[PDB]
Amino acid sequence: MHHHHHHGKPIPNPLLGLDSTENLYFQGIDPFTMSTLQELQENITAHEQQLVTARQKLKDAEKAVEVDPDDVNKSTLQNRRAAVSTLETKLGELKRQLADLVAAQKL
């Protein structure tokens, strides 16, 4: 260099005590908890369309006791209506997986 300086510092002051910390922190994570949202909210929707269709399949089984009322086409109703019960059990448990999932898409 081609120049000079005259910098300096004063003497200390009687304030002795805690003067250092360990507050250093960092954060980052994969999106997998909401990749699971995108799968499970789609699982809700597909198991809901399979549930509207299970309603529609039970209406097609009512359409069967309409056309040929054997005790089976009425029991076959209770079977299609049993898929609606499968599907409905799922969607309560599924929409609750979401209420747990969704409450972690926050994090």
User: What SS3 string covers the chain?
Assistant: CCCCCCCCCCCCCCCCCCCCCCCCCCCCCCCHHHHHHHHHHHHHHHHHHHHHHHHHHHHHHHHHHHHCCCHHHHHHHHHHHHHHHHHHHHHHHHHHHHHHHHHHHCC
Q: Assess if residue 8 is contained within a domain.
A: no
Domains contained in the chain, number: 1
Return phi, psi of residue 31, to 5°. Answer: -80, 10
Q: How far apart are CA 41 and CA 97, in angstroms?
A: 9
Would you mind telling me the total number of residues written for the chain in this entry?
107
Structural domain boundaries enclosing 50: 30-107
Side chain identity, residue 66? E
Domain of 85, CATH number, reads: 1.20.58.90
CB 60 within 8 A of CB 81: no
Q: What angle do CA 93, 94, 100 make, to 5 degrees?
A: 90
Q: Rounded to the nearest 10 degrees, what angle do helices 71-105 and 32-67 cross at?
A: 160
Q: Assess if residue 22 is contained within a domain.
A: no
Q: Which method was used?
A: NMR
Q: How far apart are CA 104 and CA 23, in angstroms?
A: 26
Q: Assess if residue 96 is contained within a domain.
A: yes
Q: Assess if residue 2 is contained within a domain.
A: no
